[PDB]
Design a protein around this ligand. Structure first.
Ligand code: HEM
Ligand code: NA
Length: 153
């Protein structure tokens, strides 16, 4: 369980993300796909993209980035009371997309990397630790839901 103090570090960096969610989503998706190319193969819409330049120029990738980060934002803003938000997300990522927890760990890493790089003013050691705690809570709750849904993750 996160303290309120930890949630405020989380939401204070998220407020900077929200200056330009589209830009942050591009950086984060591209970071994921470059760091762990196997993750791109899960995307039938995007797996043809060969290079970072092609990724940067993809209007649909940018759109998806916004979808992803807005969903994650809505979860974080619940400060752990995210049962309703996680249900549809768990069901799609388990049953339709088939995303192992391992890959959730990878996008968590991508998120932290990008925030560390873009927001040194709001992502010092304490803030990063809070965000890590929030993303670990997220993955823990998702993993539990995966199991309920019949997916080993
Ligand atoms: C913070 C973690 C994540 C969030 C908040 C997130 C959020 C979303 C949302 C909102 C959608 C659209 C609605 C849906 O189908 O549920 C989506 C679709 C999808 N997600 Fe995720 N996602 C996350 C992690 C992942 C990861 C790590 C992968 C793969 C490595 C992945 C693969 C997909 C795929 C393949 C789709 C369908 C894309 C399409 O429209 O063709 N997601 N995600
Ligand atoms: Na800006």
């Amino acid at each position: 369980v996160l303290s309120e103090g930890e949630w405020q570090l989380v939401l204070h960096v998220w407020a900077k993300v929200e200056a330009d969610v589209a830009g942050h989503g591009q950086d984060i998706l591209i970071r994921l796909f470059k760091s762990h190319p196997e993750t791109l193969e899960k995307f039938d819409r995007f797996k043809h993209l060969k290079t970072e330049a092609e990724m940067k120029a993809s209007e649909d990738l940018k759109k998806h980035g916004v979808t992803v980060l807005t969903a994650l934002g809505a979860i974080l803003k619940k400060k752990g009371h995210h049962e309703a938000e996680l249900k549809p997300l768990a069901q799609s990522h388990a049953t339709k997309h088939k995303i192992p927890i391992k890959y959730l760990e990878f996008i968590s890493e991508a998120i932290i990397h990008v925030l560390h790089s873009r927001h040194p003013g709001n992502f010092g050691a304490d803030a990063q630790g809070a965000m890590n705690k929030a993303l670990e809570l997220f993955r823990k709750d998702i993993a539990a839901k995966y199991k309920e849904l019949g997916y080993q993750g």
